[PDB]
């Protein structure tokens, strides 16, 4: 049954794989990263600074220090959803890897816009814009199963040489899709020197 546009990958009679367009579409985080740039709504929850080395992963050390600080924020400064107060002492496997949670601005609705190499977080609080092109320094970014298993956390860097773990929640349709966006704009430019 060939006649429309001949060939097999353009005869409107095949499996999925978009086909109608050359790009692909994929989820909205990527389709917009290449387009004008996605834009969700995640409220910021202050910023915690660290004093440990950098360029490190550690599957156990990252969950102990990341959950430790993130615990003092969702607990000491209410704002999260399911971790305000419920007796959560537990030990604290950590010798020299942390800093202090800064709750100077707990609750600051900001639009998380992700463009091709332009993670700009508009400010929906006092009509401002948290960086119109946050995509050059930073240091570590994530927020899926581990870390918070619900919220998003990304340590940034630029004004100072101290990684600042950013804790944000209530993104509105993000978690996995948002992780795909930050990763997209992440590998856009960043002066790809390529070793």
């Amino acid at each position: 049954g060939s006649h429309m546009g001949q060939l097999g990958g353009e005869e409107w009679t095949r499996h999925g794989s978009f086909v109608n367009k050359p790009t692909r579409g994929w989820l909205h985080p990527n389709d917009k990263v290449m387009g004008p740039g996605v834009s969700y709504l995640v409220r910021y929850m202050g910023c915690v600074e660290v004093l440990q080395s950098m360029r490190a992963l550690d599957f156990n050390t990252r969950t102990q220090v990341t959950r430790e600080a993130i615990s003092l924020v969702c607990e000491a400064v209410p704002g999260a959803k399911g971790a305000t107060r419920r007796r959560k002492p537990c030990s604290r496997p950590l010798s020299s890897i942390l800093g202090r949670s800064n709750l100077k601005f707990a609750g600051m609705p900001i639009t998380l816009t992700v463009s091709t190499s332009s993670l700009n977080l508009m400010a929906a609080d006092c009509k401002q814009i948290i960086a119109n092109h946050h995509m050059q320094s930073i240091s570590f970014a994530s927020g899926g199963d581990p870390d918070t298993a619900e919220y998003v956390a990304y340590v940034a860097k630029d004004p100072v040489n101290q990684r600042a773990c950013h804790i944000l929640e209530c993104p509105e349709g993000l978690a996995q899709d948002v992780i795909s966006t930050i990763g997209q704009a992440f590998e856009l430019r960043f002066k790809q020197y390529l070793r």
């Binding site: 360029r55 992963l57 930073i138 570590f140 992440f186 390529l194 070793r195």
Partner: peptide, 12 residues
Amino acid sequence: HIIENPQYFSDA
């Protein structure tokens, strides 16, 4: 799901 850049975190 650990978003990392090739400038700060190098893995290759």
